[PDB]
C-alpha cells in the first residue's frame, strides 16, 4: 500500500500538471488497465483511490518475485 | 537530426490527439439524464437510510 498509494500520489499530481486533454490523451491510456472505471477527475486522490483495481495478492506477487527463474516465469 | 526527430514527435502528438478526438466523437455522449436518474434514485436511498441510521 505504501507503493500503491505513492503511485497514486504521483499520478494525481501528474494529472493536475497536465491539461485535461493530456489527461484523456496521454495519462489515461496508462491508467486504464489498473482502473475499474475511467474517471477524468483522477487528479483527486479520492477519485483515483476509489477507482483502482484490486492489487496483486502479496502471496502471489512474492512467489513470482522470489522465484530465482523470474525471467522464465514471466 | 534534432529537428528531424522533433517533427516526428510533434506529428505523433497530432496523430494521438486526432485519434482520441475520433474516440470521443465515435462514442455516443452519455445521456446525463440517464445517469442523473440513477443518481437521484440513489440519493433517495441515501436519505431514507440516513433517517434509519439516525433512529
Amino acid at each position: 500500500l505504501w507503493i500503491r498509494y505513492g503511485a497514486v500520489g504521483f499520478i494525481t499530481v501528474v494529472a493536475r500538471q497536465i491539461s485535461t486533454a493530456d489527461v484523456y490523451c496521454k495519462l489515461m491510456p496508462y491508467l486504464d488497465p489498473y482502473i475499474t472505471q475511467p474517471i477524468i477527475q483522477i487528479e483527486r486522490k479520492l477519485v483515483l483511490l476509489s477507482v483502482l483495481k484490486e492489487p496483486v495478492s502479496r502471496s502471489i506477487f512474492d512467489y513470482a518475485l522470489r522465484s530465482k527463474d523470474i525471467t522464465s516465469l514471466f | 537530426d534534432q529537428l528531424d526527430t522533433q517533427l516526428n514527435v510533434t506529428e505523433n502528438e497530432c496523430q494521438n490527439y486526432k485519434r482520441c478526438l475520433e474516440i470521443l466523437e465515435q462514442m455516443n455522449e452519455d445521456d446525463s439524464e440517464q445517469l442523473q436518474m440513477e443518481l437521484k434514485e440513489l440519493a433517495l436511498e441515501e436519505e431514507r437510510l440516513i433517517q434509519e441510521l439516525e433512529d
Binding site: T20, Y24 | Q6, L7, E13, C14, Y17, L21
Partner: peptide, 29 residues
C-alpha cells in the same frame, strides 16, 4: 535526406499549429 533545415522549421510551426488546434478540439469533446 534532402529537405532543408529552414523548410523543416516551417513544418514544425505547421505541426504545432495543428497540435494546439487538436488540443482545443479535444477540450470541446
Amino acid at each position: 535526406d534532402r529537405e532543408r533545415f529552414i523548410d523543416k522549421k516551417e513544418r514544425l510551426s505547421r505541426l504545432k499549429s495543428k497540435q494546439e488546434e487538436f488540443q482545443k478540439e479535444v477540450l470541446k469533446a
